[PDB]
Amino acid sequence: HMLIQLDQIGRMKQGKTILKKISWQIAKGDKWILYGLNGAGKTTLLNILNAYEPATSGTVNLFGKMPGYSAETVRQHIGFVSHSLLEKFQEGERVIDVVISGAIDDEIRNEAHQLLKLVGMSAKAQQYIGYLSTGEKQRVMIARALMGQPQVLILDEPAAGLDFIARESLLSILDSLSDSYPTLAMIYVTHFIEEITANFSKILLLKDGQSIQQGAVEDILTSENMSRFFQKNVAVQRWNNRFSMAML
Amino acid sequence: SHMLIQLDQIGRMKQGKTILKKISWQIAKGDKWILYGLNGAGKTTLLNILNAYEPATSGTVNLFGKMPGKVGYSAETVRQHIGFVSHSLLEKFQEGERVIDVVISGAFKSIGVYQDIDDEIRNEAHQLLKLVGMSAKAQQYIGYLSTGEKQRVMIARALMGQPQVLILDEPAAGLDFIARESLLSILDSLSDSYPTLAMIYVTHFIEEITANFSKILLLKDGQSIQQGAVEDILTSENMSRFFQKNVAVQRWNNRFSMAML
């Protein structure tokens, strides 16, 4: 059931502490929010999970593999959606081909077509990715990420730049994917609790490279807890199965 | 005049296509406006008309008592009345420029380049830095600043020469919760400090609308769908009709929340 286990891991660079005493367990079916301000160390933590950067201390177990092993193998278990990857594609590539590249035969092409249906992008399968909105491109990237049959889908601020309609479209797709793939784990990295859907039930609060709280979203996301987290008076409400947060 | 900008049924067409259609909009001293719409709604094109970067193709435009192309009309003169904060503006500044010097350059729009920067002008820049919470970093290279801090410096710069309108083009883009709230708190402070200053806050998130912003224009596909009091317009029923999708809106702790249903 366990996919990723970090036990009291640390990350240092040039004498500076980047991450400190992080313990994190990600199991099949888990839907996690990774939350923190800009500068909190979220990206460094993702670099550890994706095996781009090593922990300097603690123990890292990625899908049964520990350093001391190959990063390439670890990454075959992970579907990673980030802004850097959206830019590796060129205007003139067809959507279907961009998805295919996430894996060529009739079954691989069929797998790409089914995933496009799941992300609501079937009508634009033959289109040049150049013609798509940012929202549409992010959904294509999600289908591409799922092609390599991963055990964890990691979304690094996937709703950045999206308006309300585009954001909710993407969020609804994640709810759909979770229905089709119950055992798929997801990590959704964000600065805005307004993006947290009922599907995402677990949260890790990251501040200055440290895990402050982790557990159930419903227990952790409170005015009291977020006020402590920020050291500023904030109000949190759950209303219509979504969260809002007001600075007071 | 208390009347700053008057657009009467303006249109904008480009290469045979309708970009903006039938926009009427009156901005008066002290007005604090939200300009709200999805990506692609035409918000930037509308800002271009207000800033005299692009002309209207129909209707009438009155920008600070000047109409194209009557006596005294000049795009440059229109812009002297406007403080404009936008992403394109920020990164024309280089990392090695001092914060104080960057704010000082806001004056040159209204005074030209010959006039000596005196104690009165430096006084003005330093006072504006205080207002935006950036005094401590006056002597710092703008390159060492956070995105949120950079935005605050741009606001200070925009307010040099006492514009009549402050226009903020999606100023919270890329900011985390604390940086966003710091920016919004500054705008609230500026509104109390300068109650006659009109402001236009362009956004696609209702969560960014503070209590001091009391008026809103809803833009969809180049058209003004509704405009009026935020309390009246930001409701579940109105926003559901705007999107053609079932949404719920609430005002809670002097801020708005909106949930997809």
Coordinates of C-alpha atoms in Angstrom, one line a residue:
Chain A
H1 CA 0.0 0.0 0.0
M2 CA 2.9 2.3 0.7
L3 CA 4.3 4.2 -2.3
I4 CA 6.6 6.9 -0.9
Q5 CA 8.1 7.0 2.6
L6 CA 10.3 9.9 3.8
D7 CA 11.5 9.4 7.4
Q8 CA 12.8 12.6 9.1
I9 CA 14.6 13.7 5.9
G10 CA 16.7 16.9 5.6
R11 CA 18.1 18.9 2.7
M12 CA 21.1 21.2 3.0
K13 CA 22.9 23.2 0.3
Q14 CA 26.1 25.3 0.8
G15 CA 25.7 25.0 4.6
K16 CA 22.1 26.3 4.6
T17 CA 19.2 24.2 5.8
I18 CA 16.6 23.9 3.0
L19 CA 14.4 21.1 4.4
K20 CA 14.3 19.9 8.0
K21 CA 12.9 16.8 9.7
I22 CA 10.3 15.9 7.1
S23 CA 8.4 12.7 7.6
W24 CA 5.9 11.9 4.9
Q25 CA 4.1 8.7 3.9
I26 CA 2.1 8.5 0.6
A27 CA 0.0 5.5 0.1
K28 CA -2.1 4.1 -2.8
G29 CA -5.3 6.2 -3.2
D30 CA -4.0 9.2 -1.1
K31 CA -4.9 12.6 -2.3
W32 CA -2.6 15.1 -0.7
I33 CA -2.4 18.9 -0.7
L34 CA 1.1 20.3 -0.3
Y35 CA 0.6 23.8 1.0
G36 CA 3.0 26.6 1.8
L37 CA 3.9 30.2 0.9
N38 CA 6.3 31.0 -2.0
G39 CA 9.8 30.1 -0.6
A40 CA 8.6 27.4 1.7
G41 CA 10.7 24.6 0.1
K42 CA 7.8 22.9 -1.8
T43 CA 9.8 22.6 -5.0
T44 CA 12.9 21.2 -3.2
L45 CA 10.6 18.6 -1.6
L46 CA 9.2 17.7 -5.0
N47 CA 12.7 17.4 -6.3
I48 CA 13.4 14.8 -3.6
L49 CA 10.2 12.8 -4.6
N50 CA 11.1 13.0 -8.3
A51 CA 14.7 11.9 -7.5
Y52 CA 16.2 15.1 -9.0
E53 CA 17.9 15.9 -5.8
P54 CA 19.0 13.7 -2.9
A55 CA 18.1 14.1 0.8
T56 CA 21.2 15.0 2.8
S57 CA 19.9 13.2 5.9
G58 CA 17.1 10.8 6.9
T59 CA 15.8 7.9 4.8
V60 CA 14.1 8.0 1.4
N61 CA 12.1 5.1 0.1
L62 CA 10.6 5.7 -3.4
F63 CA 8.4 2.8 -4.6
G64 CA 10.6 0.2 -2.8
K65 CA 13.9 1.7 -4.0
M66 CA 16.5 3.5 -1.8
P67 CA 19.7 5.4 -2.8
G68 CA 22.7 3.2 -2.0
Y69 CA 18.8 2.3 -7.5
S70 CA 18.1 4.7 -10.4
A71 CA 16.2 8.0 -10.6
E72 CA 14.9 7.1 -14.1
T73 CA 13.2 4.1 -12.6
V74 CA 11.7 6.1 -9.8
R75 CA 10.3 8.6 -12.3
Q76 CA 8.5 5.8 -14.3
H77 CA 6.2 5.5 -11.2
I78 CA 5.5 9.3 -11.2
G79 CA 3.3 11.5 -13.5
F80 CA 4.6 15.0 -13.0
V81 CA 2.8 18.1 -14.2
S82 CA 4.7 21.4 -13.9
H83 CA 5.1 24.7 -15.8
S84 CA 8.6 23.7 -17.0
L85 CA 7.2 20.7 -18.9
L86 CA 4.3 22.7 -20.5
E87 CA 7.0 24.7 -22.4
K88 CA 8.9 21.7 -23.8
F89 CA 6.3 21.3 -26.5
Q90 CA 5.9 23.4 -29.7
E91 CA 2.8 25.0 -31.2
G92 CA 2.7 22.7 -34.2
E93 CA 2.5 19.3 -32.4
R94 CA -0.9 17.6 -32.5
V95 CA -2.6 17.0 -29.1
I96 CA -2.9 13.3 -29.6
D97 CA 0.9 13.0 -30.4
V98 CA 1.8 15.1 -27.3
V99 CA -0.2 12.6 -25.2
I100 CA 1.3 9.5 -27.0
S101 CA 4.8 10.9 -26.1
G102 CA 4.1 10.3 -22.4
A103 CA 4.6 6.5 -23.1
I104 CA 4.1 3.0 -30.6
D105 CA 1.1 0.8 -31.6
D106 CA -2.7 0.7 -31.9
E107 CA -3.0 0.1 -28.1
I108 CA -0.7 3.0 -27.1
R109 CA -2.7 5.3 -29.4
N110 CA -5.9 3.9 -27.9
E111 CA -4.5 4.5 -24.4
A112 CA -3.8 8.1 -25.4
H113 CA -7.3 8.6 -26.8
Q114 CA -9.0 7.2 -23.7
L115 CA -7.1 9.5 -21.4
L116 CA -8.0 12.5 -23.6
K117 CA -11.7 11.6 -23.1
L118 CA -11.0 11.5 -19.3
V119 CA -9.5 15.0 -19.3
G120 CA -12.3 16.4 -21.5
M121 CA -10.1 16.9 -24.5
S122 CA -11.4 14.4 -27.1
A123 CA -12.9 17.0 -29.4
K124 CA -9.4 18.6 -29.8
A125 CA -7.3 15.4 -30.1
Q126 CA -6.3 16.3 -33.8
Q127 CA -5.5 19.9 -33.0
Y128 CA -2.2 21.7 -32.9
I129 CA -1.4 22.3 -29.2
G130 CA -0.7 25.9 -30.3
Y131 CA -4.5 26.5 -30.7
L132 CA -5.3 25.6 -27.1
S133 CA -5.9 27.7 -24.0
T134 CA -3.7 27.4 -20.9
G135 CA -6.4 25.4 -19.2
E136 CA -6.7 23.1 -22.2
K137 CA -2.9 22.6 -22.4
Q138 CA -2.8 21.7 -18.7
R139 CA -5.4 19.0 -19.2
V140 CA -3.4 17.6 -22.1
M141 CA -0.3 17.6 -19.9
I142 CA -2.3 15.6 -17.3
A143 CA -3.3 13.0 -19.9
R144 CA 0.3 12.8 -21.1
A145 CA 1.5 12.3 -17.4
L146 CA -1.0 9.4 -17.0
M147 CA 0.3 7.5 -20.1
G148 CA 3.3 6.1 -18.3
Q149 CA 0.9 4.2 -16.1
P150 CA 2.2 6.0 -12.9
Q151 CA 1.3 5.2 -9.3
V152 CA 1.5 8.9 -8.2
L153 CA 0.3 12.0 -10.1
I154 CA 2.1 15.2 -9.0
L155 CA 0.6 18.5 -10.0
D156 CA 2.8 21.5 -9.3
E157 CA 0.5 24.6 -9.0
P158 CA -1.5 23.3 -12.0
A159 CA -4.1 26.1 -11.8
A160 CA -1.6 29.0 -12.1
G161 CA -2.8 31.7 -14.5
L162 CA -6.3 30.0 -14.9
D163 CA -9.5 31.9 -14.5
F164 CA -12.5 30.6 -12.4
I165 CA -14.0 28.5 -15.2
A166 CA -10.7 27.0 -16.4
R167 CA -9.7 26.2 -12.8
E168 CA -12.9 24.4 -12.0
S169 CA -12.7 22.4 -15.3
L170 CA -9.2 21.2 -14.3
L171 CA -10.4 20.4 -10.7
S172 CA -13.4 18.5 -12.0
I173 CA -11.2 16.4 -14.2
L174 CA -9.1 15.4 -11.1
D175 CA -12.3 14.2 -9.4
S176 CA -13.1 12.2 -12.6
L177 CA -9.6 10.6 -12.7
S178 CA -9.9 9.6 -9.1
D179 CA -13.1 7.8 -9.9
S180 CA -11.5 5.9 -12.8
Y181 CA -8.3 5.2 -10.9
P182 CA -9.1 4.7 -7.1
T183 CA -5.6 3.5 -6.3
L184 CA -3.9 6.4 -8.0
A185 CA -2.3 8.8 -5.5
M186 CA -2.2 12.5 -6.1
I187 CA -0.1 15.4 -4.7
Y188 CA -1.6 18.8 -5.5
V189 CA 0.8 21.6 -4.8
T190 CA -0.9 25.1 -4.2
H191 CA -0.9 28.5 -2.4
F192 CA -4.7 28.8 -2.5
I193 CA -7.0 26.7 -0.3
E194 CA -9.8 27.7 -2.7
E195 CA -8.4 25.1 -5.0
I196 CA -8.8 22.2 -2.5
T197 CA -11.7 19.9 -3.5
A198 CA -13.4 17.4 -1.3
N199 CA -11.4 14.6 -3.2
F200 CA -8.2 15.9 -1.6
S201 CA -8.6 14.8 2.0
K202 CA -5.0 15.1 3.3
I203 CA -2.7 18.1 3.7
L204 CA 0.9 18.9 4.6
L205 CA 1.6 22.4 5.8
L206 CA 5.1 23.5 4.9
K207 CA 6.8 26.6 6.4
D208 CA 10.5 27.5 6.2
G209 CA 11.4 23.9 5.0
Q210 CA 9.5 22.2 7.9
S211 CA 6.3 20.3 8.1
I212 CA 4.1 22.2 10.6
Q213 CA 1.0 20.0 10.5
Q214 CA -0.1 17.0 8.5
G215 CA -3.4 15.1 8.5
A216 CA -7.0 15.5 7.4
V217 CA -7.8 18.7 5.5
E218 CA -11.0 19.0 7.6
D219 CA -9.1 19.0 10.9
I220 CA -6.1 21.1 9.9
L221 CA -7.7 23.9 7.7
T222 CA -9.1 26.0 10.5
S223 CA -9.0 29.8 11.4
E224 CA -7.0 28.8 14.6
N225 CA -4.5 26.5 12.9
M226 CA -3.9 28.8 9.8
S227 CA -3.5 31.8 12.1
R228 CA -0.7 29.9 13.9
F229 CA 0.8 28.8 10.6
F230 CA 1.0 32.4 9.2
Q231 CA 1.4 34.2 12.6
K232 CA -1.4 36.5 11.3
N233 CA -5.1 36.5 12.2
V234 CA -7.0 34.7 9.4
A235 CA -10.5 33.3 9.1
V236 CA -11.2 30.0 7.4
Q237 CA -14.6 28.6 6.4
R238 CA -15.8 25.5 4.7
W239 CA -18.8 26.4 2.6
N240 CA -20.4 24.4 -0.2
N241 CA -17.6 21.7 0.2
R242 CA -14.8 24.2 -0.6
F243 CA -12.6 26.4 1.5
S244 CA -12.3 30.2 1.8
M245 CA -9.8 32.1 3.8
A246 CA -10.0 35.8 4.9
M247 CA -7.2 37.9 6.3
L248 CA -8.7 39.7 9.3
Chain B
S1 CA -14.5 68.1 -12.8
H2 CA -15.3 65.2 -10.4
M3 CA -15.9 63.1 -13.6
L4 CA -12.7 61.5 -14.7
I5 CA -13.4 59.1 -17.5
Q6 CA -16.6 58.8 -19.6
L7 CA -17.0 56.1 -22.3
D8 CA -20.4 56.3 -24.1
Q9 CA -21.3 53.1 -26.0
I10 CA -17.7 52.6 -27.2
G11 CA -16.7 49.8 -29.6
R12 CA -13.3 48.5 -30.7
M13 CA -12.9 46.6 -34.0
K14 CA -9.7 45.1 -35.5
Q15 CA -9.3 43.6 -38.9
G16 CA -13.1 43.2 -39.4
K17 CA -13.7 41.6 -36.0
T18 CA -15.5 43.0 -33.0
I19 CA -13.3 43.2 -29.9
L20 CA -15.3 45.4 -27.7
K21 CA -19.0 46.2 -28.0
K22 CA -21.3 48.9 -26.5
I23 CA -19.3 49.7 -23.4
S24 CA -20.6 52.7 -21.4
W25 CA -18.5 53.5 -18.3
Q26 CA -18.3 56.5 -16.0
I27 CA -15.4 56.8 -13.5
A28 CA -15.6 59.6 -11.0
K29 CA -13.1 60.8 -8.3
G30 CA -13.1 58.4 -5.3
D31 CA -14.6 55.5 -7.3
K32 CA -13.1 52.1 -6.5
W33 CA -13.9 49.8 -9.4
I34 CA -13.4 46.1 -10.0
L35 CA -13.1 45.1 -13.7
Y36 CA -13.9 41.5 -13.7
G37 CA -14.0 38.8 -16.4
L38 CA -12.6 35.5 -17.6
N39 CA -9.3 35.3 -19.5
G40 CA -10.0 36.6 -23.0
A41 CA -12.9 38.8 -22.0
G42 CA -11.3 41.9 -23.5
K43 CA -10.1 43.5 -20.2
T44 CA -6.7 44.4 -21.6
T45 CA -8.2 45.9 -24.7
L46 CA -10.4 48.1 -22.5
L47 CA -7.4 49.2 -20.4
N48 CA -5.7 50.1 -23.7
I49 CA -8.6 52.5 -24.5
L50 CA -8.5 54.1 -21.0
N51 CA -4.7 54.4 -21.3
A52 CA -4.9 55.9 -24.8
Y53 CA -2.8 53.1 -26.3
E54 CA -5.6 52.0 -28.6
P55 CA -8.4 54.2 -29.9
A56 CA -12.1 53.3 -29.8
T57 CA -13.6 52.6 -33.3
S58 CA -17.1 53.9 -32.3
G59 CA -18.9 55.6 -29.5
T60 CA -17.4 58.6 -27.6
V61 CA -14.3 58.8 -25.3
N62 CA -13.8 61.5 -22.7
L63 CA -10.5 61.0 -20.8
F64 CA -10.0 63.7 -18.2
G65 CA -12.0 66.3 -20.1
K66 CA -10.1 65.6 -23.4
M67 CA -11.7 64.0 -26.4
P68 CA -10.0 62.7 -29.6
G69 CA -9.0 64.7 -31.4
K70 CA -10.1 68.1 -30.1
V71 CA -7.8 70.8 -28.8
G72 CA -5.6 69.8 -26.0
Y73 CA -6.0 66.0 -26.6
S74 CA -2.8 64.0 -26.5
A75 CA -2.3 60.4 -25.5
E76 CA 0.7 61.5 -23.4
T77 CA -1.5 64.1 -21.5
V78 CA -4.2 61.4 -20.8
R79 CA -1.5 59.2 -19.2
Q80 CA -0.3 62.0 -16.9
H81 CA -3.5 61.5 -15.0
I82 CA -3.1 57.7 -14.7
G83 CA -0.9 55.5 -12.4
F84 CA -0.7 52.1 -14.2
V85 CA 0.5 48.9 -12.6
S86 CA 1.0 46.1 -15.0
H87 CA 3.3 43.1 -15.5
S88 CA 4.9 44.5 -18.7
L89 CA 5.9 47.7 -16.8
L90 CA 7.7 45.9 -13.9
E91 CA 10.3 44.0 -15.9
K92 CA 11.5 47.0 -17.9
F93 CA 13.4 47.7 -14.7
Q94 CA 16.8 46.2 -14.2
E95 CA 18.0 44.3 -11.1
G96 CA 20.7 46.8 -10.3
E97 CA 18.4 49.8 -10.0
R98 CA 17.8 51.1 -6.4
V99 CA 14.2 51.0 -5.1
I100 CA 14.2 54.8 -4.3
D101 CA 15.5 55.6 -7.8
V102 CA 12.8 53.4 -9.4
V103 CA 10.0 55.3 -7.5
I104 CA 11.6 58.7 -8.3
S105 CA 11.3 57.9 -12.0
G106 CA 7.5 57.9 -11.7
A107 CA 7.7 61.7 -11.5
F108 CA 9.3 62.1 -15.0
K109 CA 5.9 61.3 -16.6
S110 CA 4.5 64.6 -15.3
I111 CA 7.6 66.8 -15.0
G112 CA 9.9 65.8 -17.8
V113 CA 13.6 65.0 -17.6
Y114 CA 15.3 68.4 -17.2
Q115 CA 14.0 69.4 -13.8
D116 CA 16.3 68.7 -10.8
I117 CA 15.3 66.0 -8.3
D118 CA 15.1 68.1 -5.1
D119 CA 14.3 67.4 -1.5
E120 CA 10.5 67.9 -2.2
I121 CA 10.6 65.2 -4.9
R122 CA 12.7 62.7 -2.9
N123 CA 10.4 63.5 0.0
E124 CA 7.5 62.4 -2.2
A125 CA 9.2 59.1 -3.2
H126 CA 10.1 58.3 0.4
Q127 CA 6.6 59.1 1.6
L128 CA 5.1 56.8 -1.0
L129 CA 7.5 54.0 -0.1
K130 CA 6.3 54.4 3.5
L131 CA 2.7 54.1 2.4
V132 CA 3.4 50.8 0.5
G133 CA 5.4 49.4 3.5
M134 CA 8.8 49.5 1.6
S135 CA 10.8 52.2 3.5
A136 CA 13.2 49.7 5.0
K137 CA 14.2 48.6 1.5
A138 CA 14.5 52.1 -0.1
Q139 CA 18.3 51.7 -0.7
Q140 CA 18.0 48.1 -2.0
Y141 CA 18.6 46.8 -5.5
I142 CA 15.2 46.0 -6.9
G143 CA 16.6 42.6 -8.0
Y144 CA 16.7 41.4 -4.3
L145 CA 13.0 42.0 -3.8
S146 CA 10.2 39.5 -3.9
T147 CA 7.5 39.6 -6.6
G148 CA 5.1 41.0 -4.0
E149 CA 7.7 43.6 -2.9
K150 CA 8.3 44.6 -6.5
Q151 CA 4.6 45.2 -7.0
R152 CA 4.5 47.4 -4.0
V153 CA 7.4 49.5 -5.4
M154 CA 5.5 49.8 -8.8
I155 CA 2.5 51.1 -6.9
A156 CA 4.6 53.7 -5.2
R157 CA 6.1 54.6 -8.6
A158 CA 2.7 54.9 -10.2
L159 CA 1.5 57.3 -7.5
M160 CA 4.3 59.8 -8.2
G161 CA 2.9 63.1 -9.6
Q162 CA -0.5 62.5 -8.0
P163 CA -2.4 60.7 -10.8
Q164 CA -6.2 60.9 -10.6
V165 CA -6.7 57.2 -11.3
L166 CA -4.7 54.2 -10.2
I167 CA -5.2 51.2 -12.6
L168 CA -4.0 47.8 -11.4
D169 CA -3.8 45.1 -14.1
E170 CA -4.1 41.8 -12.2
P171 CA -1.6 42.9 -9.6
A172 CA -1.9 39.7 -7.5
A173 CA -0.8 37.4 -10.3
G174 CA 1.8 34.9 -9.0
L175 CA 1.5 36.1 -5.3
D176 CA 0.9 33.6 -2.4
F177 CA -1.8 34.3 0.2
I178 CA 0.3 36.5 2.5
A179 CA 1.8 38.6 -0.4
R180 CA -1.7 39.0 -1.9
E181 CA -3.2 40.1 1.4
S182 CA -0.3 42.5 2.0
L183 CA -0.9 44.1 -1.4
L184 CA -4.7 44.4 -0.8
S185 CA -4.1 45.9 2.6
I186 CA -1.8 48.5 1.0
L187 CA -4.6 49.4 -1.5
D188 CA -7.0 49.8 1.4
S189 CA -4.5 52.0 3.2
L190 CA -4.1 54.1 0.0
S191 CA -7.8 54.4 -0.3
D192 CA -8.1 55.8 3.3
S193 CA -5.0 58.0 2.7
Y194 CA -6.4 59.3 -0.6
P195 CA -10.2 59.0 -0.6
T196 CA -10.5 61.1 -3.8
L197 CA -8.2 58.8 -5.7
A198 CA -10.1 56.6 -8.1
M199 CA -8.9 53.0 -8.6
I200 CA -9.6 50.3 -11.1
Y201 CA -8.6 46.8 -10.0
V202 CA -8.6 44.2 -12.9
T203 CA -9.0 40.6 -11.8
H204 CA -10.5 37.3 -12.5
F205 CA -10.8 36.3 -8.8
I206 CA -13.6 37.6 -6.6
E207 CA -11.5 36.6 -3.5
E208 CA -9.3 39.7 -4.4
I209 CA -12.2 42.2 -3.9
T210 CA -11.9 44.1 -0.7
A211 CA -14.7 46.1 1.1
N212 CA -13.2 49.4 -0.2
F213 CA -13.9 48.4 -3.8
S214 CA -17.7 49.0 -4.0
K215 CA -18.3 49.1 -7.8
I216 CA -17.9 46.4 -10.4
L217 CA -18.1 45.9 -14.2
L218 CA -18.7 42.4 -15.5
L219 CA -17.0 41.9 -18.8
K220 CA -17.8 38.9 -21.1
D221 CA -16.8 38.5 -24.7
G222 CA -16.0 42.2 -25.1
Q223 CA -19.3 43.3 -23.6
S224 CA -20.4 44.9 -20.3
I225 CA -22.9 42.4 -18.9
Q226 CA -23.7 44.2 -15.7
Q227 CA -22.3 47.1 -13.7
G228 CA -23.1 48.6 -10.3
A229 CA -22.7 48.0 -6.6
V230 CA -20.6 44.9 -5.7
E231 CA -23.2 44.0 -3.0
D232 CA -25.9 43.9 -5.8
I233 CA -23.9 42.2 -8.5
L234 CA -21.9 39.6 -6.7
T235 CA -24.7 37.1 -5.9
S236 CA -25.2 33.4 -6.7
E237 CA -28.0 34.2 -9.1
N238 CA -26.1 36.9 -11.1
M239 CA -22.8 35.1 -11.3
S240 CA -24.6 31.9 -12.3
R241 CA -26.2 33.8 -15.2
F242 CA -22.8 35.4 -16.0
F243 CA -21.0 32.0 -16.3
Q244 CA -24.0 29.9 -17.5
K245 CA -22.9 27.6 -14.7
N246 CA -24.3 27.0 -11.1
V247 CA -22.2 28.8 -8.6
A248 CA -22.7 30.0 -5.0
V249 CA -21.4 33.4 -3.8
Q250 CA -21.2 34.5 -0.2
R251 CA -19.9 37.6 1.5
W252 CA -18.1 36.5 4.7
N253 CA -15.7 38.5 6.8
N254 CA -16.0 41.5 4.4
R255 CA -14.7 39.4 1.5
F256 CA -16.4 37.3 -1.2
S257 CA -16.2 33.5 -1.7
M258 CA -17.5 31.6 -4.7
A259 CA -17.9 27.9 -5.1
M260 CA -18.6 25.9 -8.2
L261 CA -21.7 23.7 -7.5

